[PDB]
Design a protein around this ligand. Structure first.
Ligand code: GDP
Ligand code: MG
Ligand code: ZN
Lengths: 38, 204
């Protein structure tokens, strides 16, 4: 069974467009590179 | 959404981190520059019997030559490779420092220890001396970035740990830059043999 089929992103999570880190909904900037939520 | 993991690639300057990550051609052509941290994030896709897995590999711009790396570099890393150079003993002596710096921010994420440049005749750090991984119960591999030797092994181990599937396989190798040096096959057999023998021994 493919792990890509069952994979779901956390509710409210956003991928940082600059560095690809997964961030939380209540975080206005990326916890890693400080880039701003798109 | 894609299955992807932040992989930090750390180790002393000159150990071959940039060369190694650059072997993966699409990761190099599609790398993303992070200006705030001076980082290049290489998206390395590998194709497993259960679908694709992308390691976003974070490569420095040389800052490790002047001091430790800033918190943001390690933040939210899900796995790591610690690299040293088997022709430079002090790069192996600094491995505990990199491990400590890494776990201080990321705690117990899966980590692979790699000894690079095994294509070079005059190898200084032989298998018998490589013991740090056994003290921290980590996986170790000899690699040669310039010859692609064992390039996929750390990533396969990490994928197996992260997914929780010990039977995971890469159904095909990624497109890699052609080898710039040849890795003598018999030399590779000899080094792997020395590694397993060293595993037989116990650590004083
Ligand atoms: N013979 C050999 N030379 C290597 C290898 N990897 C790197 N080198 C060289 O080591 C020097 C530093 O490499 P680099 O990728 O910049 O290391 P970094 O500072 O850790 O990012 C360079 O001259 C590389 O060409 C290898 O696997 N075999
Ligand atoms: Mg570099
Ligand atoms: Zn970011």
């Amino acid at each position: 069974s493919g792990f890509g089929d069952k994979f779901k992103r956390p509710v409210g999570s956003w991928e940082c467009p600059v560095c690809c880190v997964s961030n939380k909904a209540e975080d206005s900037r990326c916890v890693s590179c400080t880039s701003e939520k798109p | 959404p894609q299955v992807q993991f932040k992989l930090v690639l750390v180790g002393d300057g000159g150990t071959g981190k940039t060369t190694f990550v650059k072997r993966h051609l699409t990761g190099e052509s599609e790398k993303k520059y992070v200006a705030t941290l001076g980082v290049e994030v290489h998206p390395l896709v590998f194709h497993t019997n259960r679908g694709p897995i992308k390691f976003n590999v974070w490569d420095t711009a040389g800052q490790e030559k002047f001091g430790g790396l800033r918190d943001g570099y390690y933040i939210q890393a899900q796995c790591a490779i610690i690299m040293f150079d088997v022709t430079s003993r002090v790069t192996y002596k600094n491995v505990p420092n990199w491990h400590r710096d890494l776990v201080r921010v990321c705690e117990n994420i899966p980590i692979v220890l790699c000894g690079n440049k095994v294509d070079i005749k005059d190898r200084k750090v032989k298998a018998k001396s490589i013991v740090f991984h056994r003290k921290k119960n980590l996986q170790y591999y000899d690699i040669s970035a310039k010859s692609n030797y064992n390039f996929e092994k750390p990533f396969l181990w990490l994928a197996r740990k992260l997914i929780g599937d010990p039977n995971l396989e890469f159904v095909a190798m990624p497109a890699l830059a052609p080898p710039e040096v040849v890795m003598d096959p018999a030399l590779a057999a000899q080094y792997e043999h020395d590694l397993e023998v060293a595993q037989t021994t116990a650590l004083p």
